[PDB]
Amino acid sequence: THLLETFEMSIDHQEDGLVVISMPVTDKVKQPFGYLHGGASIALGETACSLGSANLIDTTKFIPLGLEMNANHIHSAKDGRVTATAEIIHRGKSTHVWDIKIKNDKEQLITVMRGTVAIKP
Amino acid sequence: HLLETFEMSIDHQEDGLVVISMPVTDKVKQPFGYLHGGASIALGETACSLGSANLIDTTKFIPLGLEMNANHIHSAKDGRVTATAEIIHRGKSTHVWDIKIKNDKEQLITVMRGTVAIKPL
Amino acid sequence: HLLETFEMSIDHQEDGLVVISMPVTDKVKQPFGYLHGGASIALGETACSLGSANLIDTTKFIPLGLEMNANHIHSAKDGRVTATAEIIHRGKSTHVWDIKIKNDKEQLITVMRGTVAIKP
Amino acid sequence: HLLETFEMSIDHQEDGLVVISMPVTDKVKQPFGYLHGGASIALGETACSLGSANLIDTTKFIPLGLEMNANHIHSAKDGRVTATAEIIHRGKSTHVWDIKIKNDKEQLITVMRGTVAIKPL
Numbered sequence: 001t002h003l004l005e006t007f008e009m010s011i012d013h014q015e016d017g018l019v020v021i022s023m024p025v026t027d028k029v030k031q032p033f034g035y036l037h038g039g040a041s042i043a044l045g046e047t048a049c050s051l052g053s054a055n056l057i058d059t060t061k062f063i064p065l066g067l068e069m070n071a072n073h074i075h076s077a078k079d080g081r082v083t084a085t086a087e088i089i090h091r092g093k094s095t096h097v098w099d100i101k102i103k104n105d106k107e108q109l110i111t112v113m114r115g116t117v118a119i120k121p
Numbered sequence: 122h123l124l125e126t127f128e129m130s131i132d133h134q135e136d137g138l139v140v141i142s143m144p145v146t147d148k149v150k151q152p153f154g155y156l157h158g159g160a161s162i163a164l165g166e167t168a169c170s171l172g173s174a175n176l177i178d179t180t181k182f183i184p185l186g187l188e189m190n191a192n193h194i195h196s197a198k199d200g201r202v203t204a205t206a207e208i209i210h211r212g213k214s215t216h217v218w219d220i221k222i223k224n225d226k227e228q229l230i231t232v233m234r235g236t237v238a239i240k241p242l
Numbered sequence: 243h244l245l246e247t248f249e250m251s252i253d254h255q256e257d258g259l260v261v262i263s264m265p266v267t268d269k270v271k272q273p274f275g276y277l278h279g280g281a282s283i284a285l286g287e288t289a290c291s292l293g294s295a296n297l298i299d300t301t302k303f304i305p306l307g308l309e310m311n312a313n314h315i316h317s318a319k320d321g322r323v324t325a326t327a328e329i330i331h332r333g334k335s336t337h338v339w340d341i342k343i344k345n346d347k348e349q350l351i352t353v354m355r356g357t358v359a360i361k362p
Numbered sequence: 363h364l365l366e367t368f369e370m371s372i373d374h375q376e377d378g379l380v381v382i383s384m385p386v387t388d389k390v391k392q393p394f395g396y397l398h399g400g401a402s403i404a405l406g407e408t409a410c411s412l413g414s415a416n417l418i419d420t421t422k423f424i425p426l427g428l429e430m431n432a433n434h435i436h437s438a439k440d441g442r443v444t445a446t447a448e449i450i451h452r453g454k455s456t457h458v459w460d461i462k463i464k465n466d467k468e469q470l471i472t473v474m475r476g477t478v479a480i481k482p483l
């Protein structure tokens with residue numbers, strides 16, 4: 001579990017094609033200046049869509065591998081919690097594509113992301 | 122401080138080139154688990170943020186990650202990963218960075234491009 | 243001018259929203275040939291720049307595509323494709339746009355995110 | 363046929379490397395107008411797609427652009443632009459390509475990364 005544990009992530013909701021994961025903005029995940037590290041936000045996103053893809057496939061026959069991730073950083077986070085909402089865009093045979101939005105307490109967009117997950121035999 | 126959480130070590134910095142490594146330990150692994158893709162990307166974003174900070178007057182400007190993208194190529198299970206960030210474009214208001222992240226065996230783990238905004242303090 | 247090359251038609255505009263279409267013809271196809279991924283991406287970037295123009299004083303500023311990314315989801319063989327660009331963020335120096343490109347059969351062809359720099 | 367529409371010329375090919383140029387004309391400009399960002403990207407996607415095609419049996423497989431990203435660095439108002447695609451990773455089911463697009467003055471216009479899926483015909 002341990003990066004999920006390291007960042008103290010909590011899965012707030014899962015259903016087919018939708019994953020919501022939150023985490024506290026603490027000093028251990030901040031940049032030095034310091035705001036929430038952009039990379040920590042991206043890691044939260046990649047966690048959410050990887051979990052979503054795993055939930056959509058037969059994990060005894062297939063494995064979901066993060067293939068491509070991209071992200072725009074929009075607003076900063078200094079404290080409280082941030083929440084990633086991952087919604088599936090495309091559930092293909094060999095790839096899943098996910099839209100992920102990461103917000104702070106004040107409902108501001110911190111990071112917007114798209115992730116492509118490879119579905120491998 | 123994420124730099125400290127992931128035990129990142131700056132191996133080399135010069136104008137337009139930053140090399141930062143970190144050990145693949147449980148704290149940065151996915152549950153299964155290999156090195157978490159998000160941790161790899163965070164290492165990358167740290168490297169180019171540091172590079173950009175090194176190119177500007179940090180008493181007047183702040184380097185903020187604007188856009189990040191990444192392809193995950195191979196997995197890392199142990200040893201170290203090393204991010205090498207080389208500047209592609211040093212603009213007035215934006216920097217663009219190429220980042221390659223390799224494991225011990227010189228395998229490409231993640232390749233990234235990062236866009237860093239240079240904003241007034 | 244490429245707008246003309248691809249026969250783009252603005253179907254709807256309002257602040258922070260653009261809907262723009264184009265026909266899928268041979269001139270924008272791959273050899274095999276499907277709708278070229280690059281043509282779809284060009285429709286998207288067009289949507290972005292137009293949208294940003296509608297949001298700024300174009301007598302003082304110019305919207306320049308800064309970063310673009312895209313996932314190609316389905317192929318398009320014929321008919322028309324329609325890009326809906328909705329703004330995510332209206333900043334001083336950048337605008338971020340979400341773009342969805344669908345075909346006639348209401349299939350998702352391409353999804354994009356665009357970052358447009360606002361320059362003097 | 364887009365290649366013809368854009369008047370593209372294949373200047374050099376070898377395994378894992380493609381160079382394709384095209385003129386900067388009114389057919390591919392923005393209204394303002396410089397070279398359309400979409401046109402540059404289209405050139406890039408053409409180059410890596412050709413690169414992947416040159417590495418496979420195209421009577422059995424087809425190279426399909428899966429994910430494309432690009433940073434636009436400088437504008438082009440005239441002359442020719444040249445895209446150089448070098449392969450980063452040759453996997454069984456995906457290829458990842460680095461693409462640099464330059465003008466006559468040897469300036470970087472667009473930098474791109476392309477992920478190409480290899481699908482059975």
Ligand SMILES: CC(C)(COP(=O)(O)OP(=O)(O)OC[C@H]1O[C@@H](n2cnc3c(N)ncnc32)[C@H](O)[C@@H]1OP(=O)(O)O)[C@@H](O)C(=O)NCCC(=O)NCCS
Pocket residue numbers: 091092093094095096272276277278279314315316317318407411424425426427428479481482483
């Ligand atoms: C998405 C894609 C990359 C493959 O990944 P995938 O999602 O796991 O493959 P899937 O089988 O699940 O996707 C099915 C759809 O993708 C497309 N597709 C799948 N295999 C294809 C092939 N061998 N040839 C052409 N198109 C194909 C079809 O549009 C298909 O729609 P359908 O399900 O109604 O038949 C690829 O199929 C695709 O859509 N490419 C977009 C077109 C494009 O970029 N053209 C320019 C080439 S540079």
Ligand SMILES: CC(C)(COP(=O)(O)OP(=O)(O)OC[C@H]1O[C@@H](n2cnc3c(N)ncnc32)[C@H](O)[C@@H]1OP(=O)(O)O)[C@@H](O)C(=O)NCCC(=O)NCCS
Pocket residue numbers: 031035036037038073074075076166170183184185186187238240241242332333334335336337
């Ligand atoms: C969006 C951004 C790239 C600049 O583009 P911009 O749209 O032209 O700038 P804007 O002022 O119009 O954007 C406003 C928001 O961006 C953020 N921002 C803008 N300038 C900033 C600065 N100098 N320092 C910190 N955050 C800033 C703020 O959250 C701001 O929110 P607000 O309007 O409610 O005050 C950048 O400001 C940003 O938000 N980066 C995200 C944080 C990040 O990546 N941190 C990790 C650094 S490696």
